[PDB]
Design an enzyme around this catalytic site. Structure first.
Site, PDB file in Angstrom:
ATOM      1  N   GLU A  49       0.874  -1.167   0.000  1.00  5.80           N
ATOM      2  CA  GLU A  49       0.000   0.000   0.000  1.00  5.80           C
ATOM      3  C   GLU A  49       0.912   1.218   0.000  1.00  5.80           C
ATOM      4  O   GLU A  49       1.789   1.335   0.862  1.00  5.80           O
ATOM      5  CB  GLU A  49      -0.937  -0.026   1.212  1.00  5.80           C
ATOM      6  CG  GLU A  49      -2.173   0.841   1.114  1.00  5.80           C
ATOM      7  CD  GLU A  49      -3.127   0.402   0.020  1.00  5.80           C
ATOM      8  OE1 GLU A  49      -3.339  -0.815  -0.163  1.00  5.80           O
ATOM      9  OE2 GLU A  49      -3.733   1.286  -0.609  1.00  5.80           O
ATOM     10  N   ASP A  60      -4.814  10.659   8.388  1.00 10.60           N
ATOM     11  CA  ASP A  60      -3.528  10.247   8.950  1.00 10.60           C
ATOM     12  C   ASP A  60      -3.145  11.011  10.213  1.00 10.60           C
ATOM     13  O   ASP A  60      -3.305  12.234  10.298  1.00 10.60           O
ATOM     14  CB  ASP A  60      -2.406  10.385   7.913  1.00 10.60           C
ATOM     15  CG  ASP A  60      -2.522   9.372   6.784  1.00 10.60           C
ATOM     16  OD1 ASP A  60      -2.291   8.173   7.075  1.00 10.60           O
ATOM     17  OD2 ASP A  60      -2.803   9.740   5.624  1.00 10.60           O
ATOM     18  N   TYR A 175     -11.222  -3.169   2.838  1.00 16.97           N
ATOM     19  CA  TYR A 175     -10.445  -2.595   3.933  1.00 16.97           C
ATOM     20  C   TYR A 175     -11.274  -2.645   5.215  1.00 16.97           C
ATOM     21  O   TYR A 175     -12.258  -1.917   5.358  1.00 16.97           O
ATOM     22  CB  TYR A 175     -10.030  -1.163   3.609  1.00 16.97           C
ATOM     23  CG  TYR A 175      -8.865  -0.697   4.445  1.00 16.97           C
ATOM     24  CD1 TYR A 175      -9.020  -0.418   5.805  1.00 16.97           C
ATOM     25  CD2 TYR A 175      -7.602  -0.543   3.887  1.00 16.97           C
ATOM     26  CE1 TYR A 175      -7.942   0.012   6.584  1.00 16.97           C
ATOM     27  CE2 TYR A 175      -6.533  -0.120   4.646  1.00 16.97           C
ATOM     28  CZ  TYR A 175      -6.711   0.159   5.991  1.00 16.97           C
ATOM     29  OH  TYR A 175      -5.657   0.581   6.744  1.00 16.97           O
TER      30      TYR A 175
HETATM   31  O1  LIG Z   1      -0.855   1.166  10.760  1.00 17.59           O
HETATM   32  P1  LIG Z   1      -1.536   2.520  10.677  1.00 17.59           P
HETATM   33  O2  LIG Z   1      -2.432   2.803  11.868  1.00 17.59           O
HETATM   34  O3  LIG Z   1      -0.567   3.650  10.386  1.00 17.59           O
HETATM   35  O4  LIG Z   1      -2.517   2.441   9.397  1.00 17.59           O
HETATM   36  C1  LIG Z   1      -2.100   3.078   8.158  1.00 17.59           C
HETATM   37  C2  LIG Z   1      -2.591   2.273   6.985  1.00 17.59           C
HETATM   38  N1  LIG Z   1      -2.454   3.024   5.731  1.00 17.59           N
HETATM   39  S1  LIG Z   1      -3.514   2.785   4.539  1.00 17.59           S
HETATM   40  O5  LIG Z   1      -2.889   3.232   3.331  1.00 17.59           O
HETATM   41  O6  LIG Z   1      -3.957   1.427   4.642  1.00 17.59           O
HETATM   42  C3  LIG Z   1      -4.900   3.828   4.847  1.00 17.59           C
HETATM   43  C4  LIG Z   1      -6.185   3.341   4.671  1.00 17.59           C
HETATM   44  C5  LIG Z   1      -7.270   4.159   4.913  1.00 17.59           C
HETATM   45  C6  LIG Z   1      -7.073   5.467   5.331  1.00 17.59           C
HETATM   46  O7  LIG Z   1      -8.191   6.308   5.579  1.00 17.59           O
HETATM   47  C7  LIG Z   1      -9.399   5.790   5.397  1.00 17.59           C
HETATM   48  F1  LIG Z   1      -9.590   4.726   6.151  1.00 17.59           F
HETATM   49  F2  LIG Z   1     -10.349   6.654   5.693  1.00 17.59           F
HETATM   50  F3  LIG Z   1      -9.584   5.420   4.145  1.00 17.59           F
HETATM   51  C8  LIG Z   1      -5.787   5.952   5.506  1.00 17.59           C
HETATM   52  C9  LIG Z   1      -4.702   5.135   5.265  1.00 17.59           C
END
Ligand SMILES: O=P(O)(O)OCCNS(=O)(=O)c1ccc(OC(F)(F)F)cc1
Ligand SMILES: C=C(/N=C/c1c(COP(=O)(O)O)cnc(C)c1O)C(=O)O
Ligand SMILES: [Cl-]
Ligand SMILES: [Cl-]
Ligand SMILES: [Cl-]
Ligand SMILES: [Cl-]
Ligand SMILES: [Cl-]
Ligand SMILES: [Cs+]
Ligand SMILES: [Cs+]
Lengths: 268, 395
Positions: A49, A60, A175
């Site tokens: 990703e 984020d 997701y």
């Molecule tokens: O391990 P962490 O807590 O840093 O998670 C980061 C994962 N990154 S990602 O690209 O999957 C990802 C997936 C969804 C996000 O926002 C949304 F859910 F609203 F869509 C943001 C990042």
């Protein structure tokens, strides 16, 4: 989208979950980012990703905020990200590559043209973090026209209507959000998600990857044990980059050790 | 699905992470229910009258239009409790928070006037209030930081990015996405995801309703134009709404020109930006060619924001409303003029609206025209910043 289908078929044969790291493209620079990504793959990443740096990433927390900032400090643009994606795909023909986008970067020069460029460089899925299913129509239509899996979020507060929509509309993987809030390794998900995982399977959704707050091998195992097809970890990976900016060699050694451990936790 | 139309033409929408959609749907339902509820309306009316002081005066200038054929009235939202129009819709949203069983309030603030309004309503109505404010604004609008803290609110400085209103907005939304079960996000302008542009307008529309009744009583006719500054769009849509169907009444919105549009240091996306998606909405954005959201600039913290509410983008697109810009220096001169010749100290935000009205008069001084400026707030929060600027000149 077919690279995900092939991956999940292979993982099912081996009774294995997927481990999928997130990093920001170009963090901390273009060259070091490409090496980081090669190390993630060599250490066992089943898919990637990949974030395109955005000025205002509102899903984020601070860790990935700072990853975006470092990439910008290195001058990284979406155009350079697509250059990088071509190089990654040229090295790695089968690994599924998913982009983490914010809406303005997709909309900016035309939604259709964005997904066309994704198809041309060999991206397999696009998740647009600030587009809910209710606004998703032009994005998911453009994705499918260009053979790109549109990635939908199944939140813990999902009702039945939402589960059916994401199961129908999505491709590649679903997701599965661990919790409310923004990305970050410090906040670890609270409520079990077994109910949602089972309903998604009932509705023939794309296989579920859990993400947000996954920072340890035990959490990866727990996601698979709960029925998910795998897990995504971003902030925990990015923290290793942040901590080792002054030692690129030590940075890759710790990334390799962490990814291999997180991947080992997905094996039955 | 929604109960109400989330779009104004192409502009608007609900561009938030999926996690926030139940909170937005809940807020929309509570709003629709409250708008039909006589008890809610009576409580809101009671607070607006007996707590906030509505109706506000409509003041006729006289000195600053002398020797011209312009008649200029100021709608005196500077006299509202709290010192700005922000109080009107905070009272309504606070009642909505209670109706939804929320105990906490998140707010963003630039000028600190929405922060003060959020803090005072939270003190009155029993909510625990936390306010995000860019660190630059904490300094240049410091009197409102003192007022917020003295009323018990938590003020959280935001050092990220430009350390101004956009950055506070980002942190407020990020917080809300992890606290919405207990906290209501009391957004302070007519922007953001649906239903906020709709709610904020409906909870500000008494500005224009009163203005219409007051002008008719005093002048026997509608104004030729009503003029308001435009940050996210709340005080302007509140003045505009009741006149939208009166097609002879001009609707003039004033964006901040900052150091000059040509410098790129401004806050005027509606006339000098490009449609984009950010902060929950499809709306005009200051943005780079490859779609990064820019940082804005204005002398006035309340206008320093790189986007604008979607209903203004729509009213502009169809030609119902006209939008212009006023620079820092033009705003400063209007501030001084009102202080010295009408005895009213205006907010620097409101001074942009006044500056454009004074330009309309000065440019065509024999044009007969009846104008209303929405004097959206008082300038007590700006007196130290302005005094420093003028002292550095000499004046
Ligand atoms: O391990 P962490 O807590 O840093 O998670 C980061 C994962 N990154 S990602 O690209 O999957 C990802 C997936 C969804 C996000 O926002 C949304 F859910 F609203 F869509 C943001 C990042
Ligand atoms: C940005 C803020 N207020 C802005 C403001 C504005 C601009 O905001 P609207 O476009 O939403 O009215 C106008 N007038 C006054 C007195 C203001 O305080 C704030 O206090 O957070
Ligand atoms: Cl650098
Ligand atoms: Cl499917
Ligand atoms: Cl009503
Ligand atoms: Cl406190
Ligand atoms: Cl009437
Ligand atoms: Cs006059
Ligand atoms: Cs603005």
């Amino acid at each position: 989208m077919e690279r995900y289908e092939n991956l999940f078929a292979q993982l099912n044969d081996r009774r294995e979950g997927a481990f999928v790291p997130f990093v920001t493209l170009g963090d901390p620079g273009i060259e070091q980012s490409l090496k980081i990504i090669d190390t993630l793959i060599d250490a066992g990443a089943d898919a990637l990703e990949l974030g395109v740096p955005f000025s205002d990433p509102l899903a984020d927390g601070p860790t990935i905020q700072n990853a975006n900032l470092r990439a910008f400090a290195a001058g990284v643009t979406p155009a350079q990200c697509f250059e990088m994606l071509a190089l990654i795909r040229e090295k790695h023909p089968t690994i599924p590559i998913g982009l983490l986008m914010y809406a303005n970067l997709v909309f900016n020069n035309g939604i259709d043209a964005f997904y066309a460029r994704c198809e041309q460089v060999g991206v397999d899925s696009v998740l647009v973090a600030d587009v809910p299913v209710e606004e998703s129509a032009p994005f998911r239509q453009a994705a499918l026209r260009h053979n790109i899996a549109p990635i939908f979020i199944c939140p813990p507060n999902a009702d039945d209507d939402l589960l059916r929509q994401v199961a129908s509309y999505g491709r590649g993987y679903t997701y599965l959000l661990s919790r409310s809030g923004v990305t970050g390794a410090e906040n670890r998900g609270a409520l079990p998600l077994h109910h949602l995982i089972e309903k998604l399977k009932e509705y023939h959704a794309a296989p579920a990857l859990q993400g947000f707050g996954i920072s340890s091998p035990e959490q990866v195992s727990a996601a698979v044990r709960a029925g998910a097809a795998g897990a995504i970890s971003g902030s925990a990976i990015v923290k290793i980059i942040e901590k080792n900016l002054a030692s690129p060699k030590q940075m890759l050694a710790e990334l390799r050790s962490f990814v291999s451990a997180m991947k080992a936790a997905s094996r039955a | 699905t929604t109960l109400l139309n989330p779009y104004f033409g192409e502009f608007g929408g609900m561009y938030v992470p999926q996690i926030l959609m139940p909170a937005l749907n809940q807020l929309e339902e509570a709003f629709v229910s409250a708008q039909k509820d006589p008890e809610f309306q009576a409580q809101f009316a009671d607070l607006l009258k007996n707590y906030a002081g509505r109706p506000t005066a409509l003041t006729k200038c006289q000195n600053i239009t002398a020797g011209t054929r312009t008649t200029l009235y100021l709608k005196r939202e500077d006299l509202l409790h709290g010192g700005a129009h922000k109080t009107n819709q905070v009272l309504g949203q606070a009642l909505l928070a209670k109706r939804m069983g929320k105990s906490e309030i998140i707010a963003e603030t630039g000028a600190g006037a929405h922060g003060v309004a959020s803090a005072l309503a939270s003190a009155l109505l029993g909510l625990k209030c936390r306010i995000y404010m860019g660190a630059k604004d904490v300094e240049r609008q410091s009197p409102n930081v003192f007022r917020m803290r003295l009323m018990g609110a938590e003020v959280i400085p935001v050092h990220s990015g430009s350390a101004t209103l956009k950055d506070a907005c980002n942190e407020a939304l990020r917080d809300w996405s992890g606290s919405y079960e207990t906290a209501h996000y009391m957004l302070g302008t007519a922007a953001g995801p649906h239903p906020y542009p709709t709610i904020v307008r409906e909870f500000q529309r008494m500005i224009g309703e009163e203005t219409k009744a007051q002008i008719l009583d005093k002048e026997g006719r509608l104004p030729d134009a009503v003029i308001a500054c435009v940050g996210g769009g709340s005080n302007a849509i509140g003045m505009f709404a009741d006149f939208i169907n009166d097609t002879s009444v001009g609707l003039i919105g004033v964006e901040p020109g900052g150091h000059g549009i040509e410098t790129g240091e401004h806050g005027a996306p509606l006339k000098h930006g490009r449609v984009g998606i950010y902060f929950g909405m499809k709306a005009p954005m200051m943005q780079t060619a490859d779609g990064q959201i820019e940082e804005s600039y204005s002398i006035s913290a309340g206008l320093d924001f790189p986007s604008v509410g979607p209903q203004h983008a729509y009213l502009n697109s169809i030609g119902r409303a006209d939008y212009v810009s006023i620079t820092d220096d033009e705003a400063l001169e209007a501030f001084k003029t009102l202080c010295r010749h009408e005895g009213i100290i205006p907010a620097l935000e409101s001074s942009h609206a006044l500056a454009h009205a004074l330009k309309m008069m000065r440019e065509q001084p024999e044009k007969e025209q009846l104008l209303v400026v929405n004097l959206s707030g008082r300038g007590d929060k700006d007196i130290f910043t302005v005094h420093d600027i003028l002292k550095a000149r000499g004046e």
